[PDB]
Amino acid sequence: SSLENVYIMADKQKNGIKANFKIRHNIEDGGVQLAYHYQQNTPIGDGPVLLPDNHYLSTQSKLSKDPNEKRDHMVLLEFVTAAGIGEELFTGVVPILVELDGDVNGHKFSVSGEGEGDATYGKLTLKFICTTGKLPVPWPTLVTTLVQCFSRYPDHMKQHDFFKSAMPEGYIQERTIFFKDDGNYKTRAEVKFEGDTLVNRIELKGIDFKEDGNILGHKLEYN
Numbered sequence: 299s300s301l302e303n304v305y306i307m308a309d310k311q312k313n314g315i316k317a318n319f320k321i322r323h324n325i326e327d328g329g330v331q332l333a334y335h336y337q338q339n340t341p342i343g344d345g346p347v348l349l350p351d352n353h354y355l356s357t358q359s360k361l362s363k364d365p366n367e368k369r370d371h372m373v374l375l376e377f378v379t380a381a382g383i384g385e386e387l388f389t390g391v392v393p394i395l396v397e398l399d400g401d402v403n404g405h406k407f408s409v410s411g412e413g414e415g416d417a418t419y420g421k422l423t424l425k426f427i428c429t430t431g432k433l434p435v436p437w438p439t440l441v442t443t444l445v446q447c448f449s450r451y452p453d454h455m456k457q458h459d460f461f462k463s464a465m466p467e468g469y470i471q472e473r474t475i476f477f478k479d480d481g482n483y484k485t486r487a488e489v490k491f492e493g494d495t496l497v498n499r500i501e502l503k504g505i506d507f508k509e510d511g512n513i514l515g516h517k518l519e520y521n
Contacts, residue, residue, distance in 0.1 A: 300521065303381075304337075304355040304446075306460075313347060314340040314469070315460045323438050323512070324519040331512045332478040335442060339460065342490060343467030350458035355449050356381050359441055361521055370428040372437040374413075378420045378449040384465035385456065388417040388447065393495045394424060396444050402504030403481065403514060405434035411444060415496065417462070420450030435504070436518040443473070443485050445498050466491040481507030 304319045317337040322330045341347050355378050362373040396411035413424030426437075426444060433440075447461035461469070468490025475483040487500040507514045 299358055299360045301356065301358045304357055305352070306350060306354060307352050308349040309338060310349055312338070312340045313349070314338065315350065321442060323436075324521055325512055326517050326519055331480075331518060333439065334476040334478070335473055337471065337473045339464075339469045339471050341464040341467065341469050342488070343464065345467070346463075348457060348460050348463040350460055353383075353455065353458055354381055355379070355446065361438065361441070364425065370431070370433050372426045374422065374424050374426065374441065374444070376422040378422070378446070380449055380451045380455050380458065382455060384462040385459065387465050387491065388415075388462055390418075391416045392448075394422070394445060394498070395492075395495055396424065396426065396498045396500070398440070398444060398500040398502060400502035400504070402435050402483070402502070403507045406430070407434055409433070409440065409444065415445060415448035417448045417450055420448065422448050435513050436516055437520065438518055439477075439483075439513060440502075442475070443483065443487070443500055443502055445489060445496060447489065447496065477507075477511075477513055480511040480513055481505055
């Protein structure tokens with residue numbers, strides 16, 4: 299498993315939030331590949347949202363494989379809890395669909411994911427398939443791109459949950475992810491309800507990657 303803290307701050311000028319954090323990918327030789335994340339979220343609707351005090355999301359991920367699956371894929375379990383120093387839509391189990399189109403150093407690919415979120419327990423369970431064939435980057439590098447409205451906000455912090463407050467209309471989530479000493483991803487996603495289903499539609503563009511670096515060279519552990 300992995301555990302990372304997403305640091306969130308209000309962005310009042312855009313009626314949204316910003317975030318930053320670092321992901322530590324494990325390299326097959328024992329090293330670490332840092333991926334520095336810079337994030338902004340803006341609401342799709344023109345109504346009020348919850349603009350939070352500074353806080354973090356404590357985010358734990360576990361990656362596995364479906365033993366009966368021969369397509370290139372990732373099974374993902376996550377537990378996420380907000381910590382210090384629209385909500386009615388999330389009181390039960392909510393189906394999730396994720397659809398991503400990407401292009402990294404000219405390698406185009408698509409990913410489709412399905413699963414469910416249970417915000418009461420901060421819990422996500424999803425399975426992702428590369429629908430175009432072989433994924434041209436390591437799965438772990440796409441985890442953060444591939445629905446923070448499923449975070450568990452403790453009752454005493456519920457006034458700081460921007461993500462659910464923007465629902466059902468949703469939000470735009472944008473990132474730049476800088477892979478240390480390597481290339482970057484830029485992502486734009488729309489996260490919103492389609493009926494009773496929470497959908498994450500994403501475009502990802504990756505540039506400046508090293509052909510023999512840890513990403514295009516597939517030198518990251520599957521974790």
